Design a protein around this nucleic acid. Structure first.
Ligand code: K
Ligand code: MG
Ligand code: MG
Ligand code: MG
Ligand code: MG
Ligand code: MG
Length: 91
RNA sequence: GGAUGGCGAAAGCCAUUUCCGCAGGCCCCAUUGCACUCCGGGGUAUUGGCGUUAGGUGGUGGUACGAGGUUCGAAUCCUCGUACCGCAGCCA
């Protein structure tokens, strides 16, 4: 089911944070406006990223487009998030 | 952190240190993991800096003391330098 936030995983853990977001914003920013991209390299967050678009139509489209797209030698696996990203909910 | 020395009852502050450790470098093991304050672990390198909230320059706000101005005089308001705390970046 739909969500303002796509969740990517199977991302190269080697890529540094700031360098990762750049590229992610570079790719997804074209499927529509992005409210933010969340990235952390914790023991449980690495490899995963939370892209937050501003309109569901963006996430959903970006989802069908990029699923499996090569990224630093690793097919991006994406799917909606499980829950409205903090900012979204409030709004 | 330790240990030793200095002023102290202490706290704290200074110092030395082929005791241990931290951030930067380089390799390594582990994790496929729905989060929104962060946060796995190890080896080697280790001059300098620092001490577990653990490196730095220049910059923004704060806190402190100092100086110049304001002022009859200021404890007010102004700007400035210095130390430190949280910020961002950048560099290690
Ligand atoms: K020493
Ligand atoms: Mg001691
Ligand atoms: Mg002593
Ligand atoms: Mg001491
Ligand atoms: Mg290191
Ligand atoms: Mg004065």
């Amino acid at each position: 089911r739909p969500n303002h936030t796509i969740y990517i995983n199977n991302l190269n853990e080697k890529i540094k944070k700031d360098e990762l977001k750049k590229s992610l914003h570079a790719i997804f920013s074209r499927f529509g406006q992005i409210l933010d991209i969340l990235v952390s390299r914790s023991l449980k967050m690495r490899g995963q990223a939370f892209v937050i678009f501003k309109e569901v139509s963006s996430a959903t489209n970006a989802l069908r487009s990029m699923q499996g797209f090569p990224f630093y030698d690793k097919p991006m696996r994406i799917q909606y998030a499980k829950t409205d990203s903090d900012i979204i909910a409030k709004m």
